[PDB]
Design an enzyme around this catalytic site. Structure first.
Site, PDB file in Angstrom:
ATOM      1  CG  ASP A   1      -0.317  -0.012   2.512  1.00 18.44           C
ATOM      2  OD1 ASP A   1       0.341   0.987   2.858  1.00 18.44           O
ATOM      3  OD2 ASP A   1      -0.458  -1.017   3.235  1.00 18.44           O
TER       4      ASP A   1
HETATM    5  C1  8Q1 Z   1       3.845   6.217  20.115  1.00 17.38           C
HETATM    6  C2  8Q1 Z   1       2.321   6.344  19.974  1.00 17.38           C
HETATM    7  C3  8Q1 Z   1       1.837   7.600  19.216  1.00 17.38           C
HETATM    8  C4  8Q1 Z   1       0.623   7.401  18.265  1.00 17.38           C
HETATM    9  C5  8Q1 Z   1      -0.193   8.691  17.938  1.00 17.38           C
HETATM   10  C6  8Q1 Z   1      -0.181   9.166  16.454  1.00 17.38           C
HETATM   11  C7  8Q1 Z   1      -1.274  10.200  16.036  1.00 17.38           C
HETATM   12  C8  8Q1 Z   1      -2.030   9.929  14.699  1.00 17.38           C
HETATM   13  C9  8Q1 Z   1      -2.446  11.168  13.833  1.00 17.38           C
HETATM   14  C10 8Q1 Z   1      -3.496  10.867  12.716  1.00 17.38           C
HETATM   15  C11 8Q1 Z   1      -3.548  11.823  11.482  1.00 17.38           C
HETATM   16  C12 8Q1 Z   1      -4.685  11.529  10.481  1.00 17.38           C
HETATM   17  O1  8Q1 Z   1      -5.685  10.966  10.828  1.00 17.38           O
HETATM   18  S1  8Q1 Z   1      -4.509  12.044   8.710  1.00 17.38           S
HETATM   19  C13 8Q1 Z   1      -6.008  11.654   7.667  1.00 17.38           C
HETATM   20  C14 8Q1 Z   1      -6.056  10.187   7.176  1.00 17.38           C
HETATM   21  N1  8Q1 Z   1      -7.127   9.906   6.214  1.00 17.38           N
HETATM   22  C15 8Q1 Z   1      -7.115  10.325   4.887  1.00 17.38           C
HETATM   23  O2  8Q1 Z   1      -6.148  10.967   4.500  1.00 17.38           O
HETATM   24  C16 8Q1 Z   1      -8.283   9.982   3.969  1.00 17.38           C
HETATM   25  C17 8Q1 Z   1      -7.953   9.189   2.686  1.00 17.38           C
HETATM   26  N2  8Q1 Z   1      -7.419   7.854   2.965  1.00 17.38           N
HETATM   27  C18 8Q1 Z   1      -6.316   7.337   2.272  1.00 17.38           C
HETATM   28  O3  8Q1 Z   1      -5.834   8.071   1.424  1.00 17.38           O
HETATM   29  C19 8Q1 Z   1      -5.746   5.927   2.566  1.00 17.38           C
HETATM   30  O4  8Q1 Z   1      -6.760   5.320   3.290  1.00 17.38           O
HETATM   31  C20 8Q1 Z   1      -4.423   5.954   3.406  1.00 17.38           C
HETATM   32  C21 8Q1 Z   1      -4.504   5.053   4.631  1.00 17.38           C
HETATM   33  C22 8Q1 Z   1      -4.175   7.390   3.825  1.00 17.38           C
HETATM   34  C23 8Q1 Z   1      -3.174   5.474   2.529  1.00 17.38           C
HETATM   35  O5  8Q1 Z   1      -2.917   6.370   1.589  1.00 17.38           O
HETATM   36  P1  8Q1 Z   1      -2.554   5.883  -0.148  1.00 17.38           P
HETATM   37  O6  8Q1 Z   1      -3.864   5.259  -0.554  1.00 17.38           O
HETATM   38  O7  8Q1 Z   1      -2.246   7.236  -0.727  1.00 17.38           O
HETATM   39  O8  8Q1 Z   1      -1.386   4.936   0.005  1.00 17.38           O
END
Ligand code: 8Q1
Ligand code: CDL
Ligand code: CDL
Ligand code: CDL
Ligand code: CDL
Ligand code: PLX
Ligand code: PEE
Ligand code: PEE
Ligand code: PEE
Lengths: 88, 54, 49, 140, 122, 175, 98, 115, 347
Positions: free
Chosen positions: A43
Site C-alpha cells: 500500500d
Molecule cells: C507512540 C504512539 C503515538 C501514536 C499517535 C499518532 C497520532 C495519529 C495522527 C493521525 C492523522 C490523520 O488521521 S490524517 C487523515 C487520514 N485519512 C485520509 O487521509 C483519507 C484518505 N485515505 C487514504 O488516502 C488511505 O486510506 C491511506 C490510509 C491514507 C493510505 O494512503 P494511499 O492510498 O495514498 O497509500
C-alpha cells in the site's frame, strides 16, 4: 582517499538488500522490476517506509515529489544514479 | 615567432594546497582568499526547565 | 593638472629638506673632526711626532 | 644504545661470525622498533592489532637486514683472511639491500638498496680505519 | 665556544676600549669605507625605484644622507674590527712567548740534506 | 623509618597525579588535583614550610573552583567518564599505579639509579638540620625579604599581572 | 636523594606524560599543566627548605604567580575555541597542516 | 599529630552519621521515587548539557587577583625591616598596580556579564 | 585592537626578550620567557578568525610545555649544586632537559611541527615577528651554556632540522609555510656551529634575520600569500619581483651574494675542528632549499604568468604605506659579502 567510485551495480545490490530487509516483502518473489503496488501487494503507506529506508541507506533525503513516483526498485536505482551522477 | 610564456594550464599546477598531490592529499583544500573560514552553525541548545507547578 | 591635492606640491618640503641636509653636513664634519683627533692621539701615544 | 654498538664492535672482524650476526640483529631490531614507534605516533593504524602487525613487520625487516649484513660481512672477512678491507662491508651492505628488496618484493628497491647500503657500509669501514669523526669534539 | 667573551679587563658594552686609541685610524679613503658608501648609494637608488620615483634624480638630499650614514657607521665598524684583530695578534704573541716549550724552533735543514722521494711521471 | 608519614604523603601525591593525568573527566581531574594540593601542603608542612603549604593549597582551591565552573560551561558531555567507565582511562590509571609501585619497590628493596641517581631510603629525617636558634621563622623572614631585596622581582611580577589582565581582555574580545 | 624527591620527580614525569597524550578534552591537558606547576613548586620548596637558603624562600611564590598567568591564558584560549566550535575537542584544531 | 587526630575524628564522626542514616531506617526504593525532581514533570533534556557562564571574564580575573593576595600576605612581616622606605614604596606599587587593573577592566566593560 | 594596547604588548614582548638577555639568575630568565609568551599570544590573534585562534592555541601549548621543562631542568641543576647563576650547568640530565626545552622553543627538529602551522595561521606581520624576534632569547641562552652542551644531541637535532626544512619546503605552495621551513633549516645551520663558535651563530642569526625581514617586507608590499597571487606582481610592480628574485637567490646561498657568507664561515669553522662529513652533508642538503627558492623565482620573476582584467584598476593607484627600512634590508641581504672580515667585531 575518500570512498570508492560507487557504480550502478553496487547501488542495485544495496537497494535489493534494503528491500529484502523489509519484513513485508518475501525475498524470492522480489525482483528489480517488481512493482510495489501490484506485484508486492504494498500500500501507499508501505511505500513511504521503503523510501525512508532508502533515505537511511543512501544518506540523502528524497522530497515528497520525486520519491512518490518510484514504484519499483529499478526506478529507485535510476533516481539514485541520476542524483549522484553515476554513469557506470 | 615569440617567446613561450606560461598559460592557464601551466599556472594551475601551483594552484593547489600542495605540490606533488597524492591520494590522501588530493582532498586538501587551499585556504580561503582571506583567512576567514565560513562560520559553522554549531547551535548551542538552551536549557529547558519546568518552573512549576510544584 | 591633477584631480586632487597630491600633498607634495611643486615646491619641496623645505623643513624636511633642510633637516636632511643639516644632518648630512653635521655627520660629515663630526667624522672629519673625529678622524683628526684620532690621528693626533695615535701619533701622540706611539711618539711618531 | 651504545651498549649494543660496543657489543658488536668489540668482537674482531673475521672471528665468531654467529655472535657478530646476533649483535647486528639486535641493532637492527632496535632501529626497527624506533621506526615503528614514530610511524605509529604520526600515522595511527586504526586498530591495536594492525599496529602490532606494522610494528612486527618493520622490526622483522630491520632485524633481518642487520642479521644478513653481519653474517655475510663476517663470513667474507674470515674466508678471504683480509680484515680491515672495506670490500667485506660492501658485500654485507649489498646483501642487506637485496634482503630489503626481497622483503618489499621489488627489484628496483633491491638494486638501489644493494648499491647504497654497500657504499655506505664501505664508507663506514673506511671511517673506522682512518679515524673519521661524525661528531667531532670541539678542539679550537 | 666563546674565545673573547671573558678576557680580563673587558668592559661589557663599550664597543671601543681606550686601548684602541693607540692604533692608527682607518684612512678616510679606505676602500672598505668607499664600499660602504657604495652600499649607501645603492640603498638610495633602490629607495627611489621602490617608491616609483626617477631612480637617479629624485632625491639628492636623501641619497646624500644614505651615503653619509653608511660611511659614518662603517668608519666605527672598521675601527672596532681592526682593534679586535690587533687584540688577537697581541694575545697570540704573548702566549707563544710565555710557553716556550710548546713552540720549539728546531734545527734548519737545507734541501741538500733532506731526502725527498722522486715520483716519475710516465 | 619513623612512621613513614612523609613517604605516605608523597605516595598519595603521586596517586592523585596519576588520577588527574589519566584524564577521566575535568570534574574528576580537579578533584584529583585538589587532593594532590592537600597532600603537598602536608609534605611542605612536615619540613617547616607552613606558609608556603597553606598558600599553595589556597591558590589551587581557587583555581579549581574556576576550573569547575569552566568544566560545567564548556567541557561537559552526556556521560562524564570516571576511572572505571573507559578502558583507556582505566588502563592509564592502572599503568600509573603499577609504575609507581614498581619504582617504590625497586628503590626501597635495592639501592639503584632509576634515571638520575641512586637512593636507599632511611626516611627523610636523616638530612634534617638540628639548628637551635631564633625568635623568628626563617621561612617567614625569607619571604618577607621580597619587599626589601626583591624590588626587581616585585616590579616584573606586578607588570606581568597587569599585562595578563590586558591580555585576557584582548584575547576574549572576539569580533 | 631521599624517597620524597623521587616521588615528586615521578609526579612531574607523570603530569608531563599526561600532557603529551591528548584524549578529547582540552581542559584535561590544562589540568596536567597545572599539575606540573604544582610539582615544581613542591620540589623547589623542599630543596630550598633543606638547604636553609633564606632569600630563595620567595621564588616559589613567583612561580605560582606565573602559573596563574599561564592558566588564565589557557582558559581564555579555551573560551575562544569553544565559542568557535561549541566544544573544546582538540580534534577541531585541524585547519592548519604541516 | 594532634591535627591529624582531629581530622581523623571529624571525618570518622561524619562517616558514622552517614552510615547510621543509611542503615537504620526502612528503605523502600522504586523507580518513580528515585527519578529526578523537576516540579512534578519529567525533564526535557539532561542536566549534563553545557550550562553557559555569563561571568566567564570575571572568573579569569579572579585567578589573577587571587595571586596578588599571596603577594600581599607577607606584609605583616615586611613591616619589620630596617629600610621601611623601600618596603612601603613596593607595597604601594603593588596595590596601585592592582587598582589600575581593576580600573582598566571596569572601563572596558569587562565586569558586565554577557547577555 | 587599540594601537596603544598593541604598542604596549609589543614592548612587553621585547621586554621579556631583553630580560632573558640581561639576566644572571635562572629565575629571571624563566620570567622573561613567561612574559614574552604572555605578551606574544594576543599579537598572534590581532586579526581574529578561527585559523588565528588555532595558531595561538598551538603556540601556547608548545611554549608552555617548553617552559615547564625549562623550569624542571633549572630545579634539578639547583638540587645537584645550589647555584642559580647561568653557567656550565653542573648536571648532565638537567643539561639534556634544558637542551630539549630550548629546542622546543626554537622549533628545531624533531619538535618542528608547530612552526609551519602557526606561521600559516597568522598574518604576515605576526609571522615576521615570530620568525625574527622570537629566535633571540633561546639562542642567547644556548650561547651562554655552549661549553656544557652535548655535541651529539645538538648536532643530531641540527642535521635533522636541515633535512626536514628542505624536504618540507619542497612540497609547499603557500608562502608562509615555505618561510617556516626555510626558518627551520636556518635554525639547524645556526645550532650546528654553536658548540664550536658562538660568533658564527651570531653572524648567521644576523644575516638570516636581515634576509627574512627583506622577504617578509616584500611580501607585505605586494599583498601575496600564495604562489599564484605572487605570480601577478610582475604586472603591477616589476621592480618588487626583481628585488625578490635577487633576495631569493641570496637565501639559497649562491656566491657572490651575502647569504653565502654564514655557510662559508660555518664550514671553515667546522673544518678547523676535524668535523669533515657534517658540513658536506649540510651543503648538499641546503641544495633543496635552493631548489624551492628557485621554483618561486621561476613563478614570480623569470616568467610572466597570465593576469586578470581588474589589474587595470590597480594600475591607477599607488602604495600608501611605505616601509622606510626595506631598501637597506635588501642591500644588506644582497651586497655585503666583501665586508666579511667585519665579523671580528661580533666577538
Ligand atoms: C507512540 C504512539 C503515538 C501514536 C499517535 C499518532 C497520532 C495519529 C495522527 C493521525 C492523522 C490523520 O488521521 S490524517 C487523515 C487520514 N485519512 C485520509 O487521509 C483519507 C484518505 N485515505 C487514504 O488516502 C488511505 O486510506 C491511506 C490510509 C491514507 C493510505 O494512503 P494511499 O492510498 O495514498 O497509500
Ligand atoms: C647503522 C646503524 C643504525 C642506523 C640508524 C639510522 C638509520 C635509520 C633508518 C630508518 C629509516 C626511516 C625512514 C625510512 C622508512 C620509510 C617509512 C616507512 O614506514 O616505510 C617502511 C617501508 C615499508 O613500509 P610501507 O608501509 O610500505 O611504507 C609506505 C608509506 O609511504 C610509508 O609511511 P608514510 O609515508 O605514510 O609515513 C610514515 C611516517 C613514519 O615516520 C618515521 O618513520 C620516522 C623516522 C625516524 C626513524 C629514525 C630512527 C633511527 C634511530 C636509530 C638510533 C640508534 C638505534 C640503536 O613518516 C613520517 O611521518 C615522516 C615525518 C617526518 C618527521 C620526523 C620525526 C622522526 C624523528 C627524527 C628521526 C629519529 C630521531 C631519533 C632521536 C632524536 C633525538 C634528537 O620499509 C620498511 O619497512 C623499513 C622500515 C625500517 C627499516 C630500517 C633499516 C635498518 C637497517 C639496520 C641494519 C643494521 C646493520 C648493522 C649495524 C652495525
Ligand atoms: C623526566 C622526563 C620523562 C617524562 C616521561 C615519563 C612518564 C612516565 C609516567 C607514565 C605514567 C602513565 C600516566 C598516564 C598517561 C596518560 C595516557 C593517556 O591519557 O592516553 C591517551 C591516549 C589516547 O586517549 P583516547 O583518545 O581516549 O583513546 C584512543 C584509543 O585508545 C586509540 O584509538 P584507535 O583504536 O583508533 O588507535 C589505534 C591504537 C593502536 O595502538 C597501537 O598500535 C599500539 C600497538 C603497538 C605494539 C606494541 C609493541 C609490541 C612489542 C614491543 C615491545 C618493546 C620491548 C621488547 C622488544 C621486542 C620483543 C621481541 O591506538 C593508537 O594508534 C594511538 C597510539 C598509542 C600507541 C602508544 C603510544 C606510546 C609511544 C608509541 C609506541 C608505538 C609502539 C611501537 C613500539 C615501541 C616500543 C613499545 O590513549 C592511548 O593512546 C592508549 C592508552 C595508554 C595508557 C597506558 C600507556 C601509558 C604509557 C606511559 C609511558 C610508558
Ligand atoms: C658511464 C657509462 C654508462 C654508465 C651508466 C649506464 C649503465 C649502468 C646503468 C644501466 C644498467 C644498470 C641497471 C641495473 C638493474 C636495474 C634493475 C631494475 O631496474 O629494477 C626495476 C625493474 C622493475 O621491475 P619490478 O617492478 O620490480 O617487477 C617486474 C619485473 O620486471 C619482472 O621480472 P621478471 O619476471 O621478468 O624476471 C626477473 C628475474 C629474471 O629476469 C628475466 O626474466 C630474464 C633473465 C635476466 C637475468 C640475467 C641473469 C643471467 C644473465 C647474466 C650473465 C652474466 C652477466 C654479464 C657479465 C659477464 C661477465 C663476463 O631477474 C631476477 O630474478 C634477478 C636475480 C639476480 C640475477 C640477475 C642479477 C645479476 C647481477 C650481475 C652481476 C655483475 C657483477 C660484476 C661482474 C664483473 C664482470 C663484468 O626491474 C626489472 O624489471 C629488471 C629485472 C632484472 C634486473 C637484474 C638485471 C641485472 C643487470 C646487470 C646489473 C649491473 C649494473 C649495476 C652494477 C652495480 C651494482 C653494485
Ligand atoms: C661586481 C662589481 C660592481 C657591481 C655592483 C653590483 C651591481 C650594481 C649595483 C646594484 C644596485 C644598484 C642599482 C639599484 C637600483 C636599481 C633598481 C632599478 O629598478 O633600476 C631601474 C633604473 C631605471 O629606472 P628609470 O631610469 O627611473 O626609468 C625607467 C623606468 O623606471 C622603467 O623601469 P620598470 O620598473 O618599469 O622596468 C621593469 C624592470 C625593472 O626591474 C629592474 O630594473 C631590475 C633591477 C633590480 C636591482 C638589483 C637588485 C639589488 C642589487 C643586487 C645586485 C646583485 C649583483 C651580484 C651578481 C648577481 C646578479 C643578480 O623589470 C623587468 O623588466 C624584469 C626583467 C627580469 C630580469 C631579472 C634580473 C634582475 C636582477 C639583475 C640585477 C643585476 C645588478 C643591477 C642591474 C642594474 C639595475 C639598474 O635604472 C637606472 O637608471 C639606475 C642605474 C644606473 C645608476 C648608476 C649610475 C651612476 C652615475 C653615473 C656615473 C658613474 C660614476 C663613475 C665615477 C667616475 C667619474 C666619471
Ligand atoms: C646582513 C648584514 C648584517 C647587518 C646587521 C645590522 C647592521 C646595523 C646595526 C647597527 C649596530 C649598532 C650597535 C653598536 C652601538 C653600541 C653597542 C655596543 O656597545 O655593543 C657592543 C657589541 O658590538 C656589536 O656586536 C657590533 C655590531 C656590528 C655588527 C656588524 C658585523 C656584521 C658581520 C660582517 C657583515 C658586514 C656588515 C656591513 C654593515 C653595513 C657590546 O659588546 P659586548 O656586550 O661585549 O658583546 C655582547 C655579545 N657577547 C659578549 C656574547 C660577545
Ligand atoms: C644509506 C641509505 C640507503 C637507502 C636504501 C634505499 C634506497 C632506495 C632509493 C631508490 C628508490 C626505490 C624505488 O623504486 O622506490 C620505492 C620507494 C617508494 O615506493 P614506490 O617505488 O613508489 O612503489 C611503487 C609500487 N607501488 O622509494 C622510497 O621510498 C625511497 C625512500 C628512502 C630514501 C632514503 C631516505 C634516507 C633518509 C636519511 C638521509 C640521510
Ligand atoms: C545525629 C543525631 C541522632 C543520631 C541518630 C540516633 C537515632 C537513635 C534512635 C533509635 C530509634 C529506634 C529506631 C526505630 C526505627 C527503625 C526502622 C523502622 O522503623 O522500620 C520498622 C521495621 C519494620 O520491619 P517489618 O515490619 O518486619 O517490615 C515491614 C516492611 N515490609 O521494624 C524494624 O526493622 C525494627 C528493627 C529495630 C531497629 C534497631 C533499633 C535499635 C537502636 C539503634 C540506634 C542506633 C544508634 C547507634
Ligand atoms: C652531479 C655530480 C657531482 C658529484 C660530485 C660529488 C663527489 C665529491 C667527492 C667526495 C666529496 C667529499 C670529500 C670531503 C672533502 C675532502 C676533505 C678531506 O680531506 O677530509 C678527509 C676525510 O675524508 C672524508 O671524510 C671523506 C668521506 C666521505 C664522506 C661523504 C661521502 C660522499 C659520497 C662518497 C662517494 C661519492 C664520491 C665519488 C662520486 C663520483 C661522482 C659521481 C681528511 O679528514 P681527516 O679526518 O682529518 O683525516 C685524518 C684524520 N682521520
Amino acid at each position: 582517499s575518500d570512498a570508492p567510485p560507487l557504480t550502478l551495480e553496487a547501488i542495485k545490490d544495496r537497494v535489493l538488500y534494503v528491500l529484502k530487509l523489509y519484513d513485508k516483502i518475501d525475498p524470492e518473489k522480489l525482483s528489480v522490476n517488481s512493482h510495489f503496488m501490484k506485484d508486492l501487494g504494498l500500500d501507499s503507506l508501505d511505500q513511504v517506509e521503503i523510501i525512508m529506508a532508502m533515505e537511511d541507506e543512501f544518506g540523502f533525503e528524497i522530497p515528497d515529489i520525486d520519491a512518490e513516483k518510484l514504484m519499483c526498485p529499478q526506478e529507485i536505482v535510476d533516481y539514485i544514479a541520476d542524483k549522484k551522477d553515476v554513469y557506470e | 615567432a615569440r617567446q613561450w610564456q606560461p598559460d592557464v594550464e601551466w599556472a594551475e599546477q601551483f594552484g593547489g594546497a600542495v605540490m606533488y598531490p597524492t591520494k590522501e592529499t588530493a582532498h586538501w583544500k587551499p585556504p580561503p582568499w582571506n583567512d576567514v573560514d565560513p562560520p559553522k552553525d554549531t547551535l548551542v541548545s538552551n536549557l529547558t526547565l519546568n518552573f512549576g507547578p510544584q | 593638472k591633477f584631480y586632487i591635492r597630491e600633498p607634495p606640491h611643486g615646491s619641496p618640503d623645505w623643513l624636511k629638506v633642510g633637516l636632511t641636509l643639516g644632518t648630512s653636513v653635521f655627520l660629515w664634519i663630526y667624522l672629519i673632526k673625529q678622524h683628526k683627533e684620532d690621528v693626533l692621539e695615535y701619533k701622540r701615544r706611539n711618539g711618531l711626532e | 644504545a651504545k651498549t649494543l654498538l660496543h657489543k658488536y664492535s668489540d668482537i674482531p672482524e673475521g672471528t665468531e661470525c654467529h655472535r657478530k650476526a646476533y649483535a647486528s640483529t639486535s641493532i637492527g631490531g632496535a632501529t626497527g622498533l624506533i621506526v615503528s614507534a614514530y610511524s605509529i605516533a604520526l600515522k595511527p593504524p586504526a586498530s591495536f592489532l594492525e599496529g602490532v602487525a606494522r610494528t612486527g613487520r618493520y622490526t622483522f625487516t630491520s632485524a633481518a637486514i642487520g642479521a644478513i649484513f653481519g653474517l655475510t660481512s663476517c663470513i667474507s672477512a674470515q674466508v678471504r683472511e683480509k680484515p680491515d678491507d672495506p670490500l667485506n662491508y660492501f658485500i654485507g651492505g649489498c646483501a642487506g639491500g637485496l634482503t630489503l628488496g626481497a622483503r618489499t618484493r621489488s627489484y628496483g628497491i633491491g638494486a638501489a638498496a644493494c648499491a647504497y647500503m654497500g657504499l655506505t657500509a664501505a664508507l663506514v669501514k673506511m671511517g673506522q680505519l682512518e679515524g673519521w669523526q661524525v661528531f667531532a669534539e670541539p678542539k679550537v | 665556544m666563546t674565545m673573547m667573551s671573558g678576557r680580563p679587563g673587558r668592559v661589557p658594552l663599550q664597543f671601543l676600549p681606550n686601548e684602541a686609541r693607540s692604533l692608527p685610524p682607518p684612512k678616510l679613503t679606505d676602500p672598505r669605507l668607499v664600499y660602504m658608501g657604495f652600499l649607501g648609494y645603492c640603498s638610495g637608488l633602490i629607495d627611489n625605484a621602490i617608491r616609483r620615483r626617477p631612480v637617479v634624480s629624485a632625491g639628492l638630499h636623501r641619497q646624500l644622507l644614505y651615503v653619509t650614514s653608511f660611511v659614518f657607521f662603517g668608519y666605527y665598524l672598521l675601527k672596532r674590527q681592526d682593534y679586535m684583530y690587533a687584540l688577537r695578534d697581541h694575545d697570540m704573541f704573548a702566549y707563544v712567548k710565555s710557553h716556550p716549550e710548546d713552540f720549539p724552533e728546531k734545527d734548519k735543514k737545507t734541501y741538500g740534506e733532506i731526502l725527498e722521494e722522486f715520483h716519475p711521471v710516465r | 623509618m619513623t612512621m613513614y608519614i612523609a613517604f605516605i604523603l608523597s605516595t598519595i601525591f603521586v596517586i592523585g597525579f596519576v588520577g588527574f593525568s589519566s584524564k577521566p573527566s575535568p570534574i574528576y581531574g580537579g578533584l584529583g588535583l585538589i587532593v594532590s594540593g592537600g597532600v603537598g601542603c602536608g609534605i611542605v608542612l612536615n619540613f617547616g614550610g607552613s606558609f608556603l603549604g597553606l598558600m599553595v593549597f589556597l591558590i589551587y582551591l581557587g583555581g579549581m573552583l574556576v576550573v569547575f565552573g569552566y568544566t560545567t560551561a564548556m567541557a561537559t558531555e552526556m556521560y562524564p567518564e570516571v576511572w572505571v567507565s573507559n578502558k583507556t582511562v582505566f588502563g592509564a590509571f592502572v599503568s600509573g599505579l603499577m609504575m609507581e609501585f614498581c619504582m617504590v619497590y625497586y628503590a626501597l628493596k635495592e639501592e639503584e639509579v632509576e634515571i638520575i641517581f641512586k637512593f636507599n631510603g632511611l626516611g627523610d629525617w636523616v638530612i634534617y638540620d638540628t639548628g637551635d636558634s631564633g625568635f623568628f621563622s626563617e621561612e617567614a623572614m625569607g619571604i618577607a625579604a621580597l619587599y626589601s631585596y626583591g624590588t626587581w622581582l616585585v616590579i616584573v611580577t606586578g607588570w606581568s599581572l597587569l599585562i595578563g589582565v590586558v591580555v585576557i581582555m584582548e584575547i576574549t574580545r572576539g569580533n | 636523594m631521599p624517597l620524597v624527591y623521587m616521588n615528586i620527580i615521578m609526579a612531574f614525569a607523570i603530569a608531563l606524560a599526561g600532557l603529551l597524550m591528548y584524549r578529547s578534552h582540552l581542559m584535561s591537558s590544562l589540568l596536567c599543566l597545572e599539575g606540573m606547576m604544582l610539582s615544581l613548586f613542591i620540589m623547589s620548596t623542599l630543596i630550598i627548605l633543606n638547604t636553609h637558603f633564606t632569600l630563595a624562600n620567595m621564588m616559589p611564590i613567583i612561580l605560582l604567580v606565573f602559573a596563574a598567568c599561564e592558566a588564565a591564558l589557557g582558559l581564555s584560549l579555551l573560551v575562544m575555541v569553544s565559542n568557535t566550535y561549541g566544544t573544546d575537542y582538540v580534534q577541531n584544531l585541524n585547519l592548519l597542516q604541516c | 599529630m594532634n591535627i591529624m587526630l582531629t581530622l581523623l575524628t571529624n571525618v570518622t564522626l561524619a562517616s558514622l552519621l552517614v552510615l547510621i542514616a543509611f542503615w537504620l531506617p526502612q528503605l523502600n526504593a522504586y523507580s518513580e521515587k528515585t527519578s529526578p525532581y523537576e516540579c512534578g514533570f519529567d525533564p526535557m533534556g539532561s542536566a549534563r548539557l553545557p550550562f553557559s557562564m555569563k561571568f566567564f571574564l570575571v572568573a579569569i580575573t579572579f585567578l589573577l587577583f587571587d595571586l596578588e593576595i599571596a603577594l600581599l600576605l607577607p606584609l605583616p612581616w615586611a613591616s619589620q625591616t630596617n629600610n621601611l622606605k623601600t618596603m612601603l614604596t613596593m607595597a604601594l606599587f603593588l596595590l596601585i598596580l592592582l587598582a589600575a587593573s581593576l580600573a582598566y577592566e571596569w572601563t572596558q566593560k569587562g565586569l558586565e556579564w554577557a547577555e | 585592537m587599540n594601537p596603544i594596547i598593541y604598542t604596549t604588548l609589543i614592548m612587553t614582548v621585547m621586554s621579556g626578550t631583553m630580560l632573558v638577555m640581561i639576566s644572571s639568575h635562572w629565575l629571571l630568565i624563566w620570567i622573561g620567557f613567561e612574559m614574552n609568551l604572555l605578551a606574544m599570544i594576543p599579537v598572534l590573534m590581532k586579526n581574529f578568525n578561527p585559523r588565528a585562534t588555532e595558531a595561538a592555541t598551538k603556540y601556547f601549548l608548545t611554549q608552555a610545555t617548553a617552559s615547564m621543562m625549562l623550569m624542571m631542568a633549572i630545579i634539578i641543576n639547583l638540587l645537584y649544586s645550589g647555584q642559580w647563576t647561568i653557567t656550565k650547568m653542573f648536571n648532565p640530565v638537567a643539561m639534556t632537559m634544558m637542551t630539549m626545552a630550548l629546542a622546543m622553543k626554537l622549533g628545531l627538529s624533531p619538535f618542528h611541527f608547530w612552526v609551519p602551522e602557526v606561521t600559516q595561521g597568522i598574518s604576515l606581520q605576526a609571522g615576521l615577528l615570530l620568525l625574527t624576534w622570537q629566535k633571540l632569547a633561546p639562542l642567547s641562552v644556548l650561547c651562554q651554556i655552549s661549553q656544557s652542551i652535548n655535541p651529539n644531541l645538538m648536532l643530531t637535532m641540527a642535521m635533522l632540522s636541515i633535512l626536514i626544512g628542505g624536504w618540507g619546503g619542497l612540497n609547499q605552495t603557500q608562502l608562509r609555510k615555505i618561510m617556516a621551513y626555510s626558518s627551520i633549516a636556518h635554525m639547524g645551520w645556526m645550532t650546528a656551529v654553536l658548540p664550536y663558535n658562538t660568533t658564527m651563530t651570531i653572524l648567521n642569526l644576523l644575516i638570516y634575520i636581515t634576509m627574512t625581514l627583506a622577504m617578509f617586507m616584500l611580501l607585505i608590499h605586494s599583498s601575496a600569500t600564495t604562489t599564484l597571487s605572487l605570480s601577478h606582481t610582475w604586472n603591477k610592480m616589476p621592480v618588487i619581483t626583481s628585488l625578490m628574485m635577487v633576495t631569493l637567490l641570496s637565501m639559497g646561498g649562491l656566491p657572490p651574494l651575502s647569504g653565502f657568507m654564514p655557510k662559508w664561515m660555518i664550514i671553515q669553522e667546522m673544518t678547523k675542528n676535524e668535523s669533515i662529513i657534517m658540513p658536506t652533508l649540510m651543503a648538499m642538503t641546503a641544495l633543496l632549499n635552493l631548489y624551492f627558492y628557485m621554483r618561486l623565482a621561476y613563478s614570480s620573476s623569470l616568467t610572466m604568468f597570465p593576469s586578470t582584467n581588474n589589474m587595470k584598476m590597480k594600475w591607477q593607484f599607488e602604495h600608501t604605506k611605505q616601509m622606510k627600512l626595506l631598501p637597506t634590508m635588501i642591500v644588506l641581504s644582497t651586497l655585503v659579502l666583501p665586508m666579511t672580515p667585519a665579523l671580528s667585531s661580533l666577538n
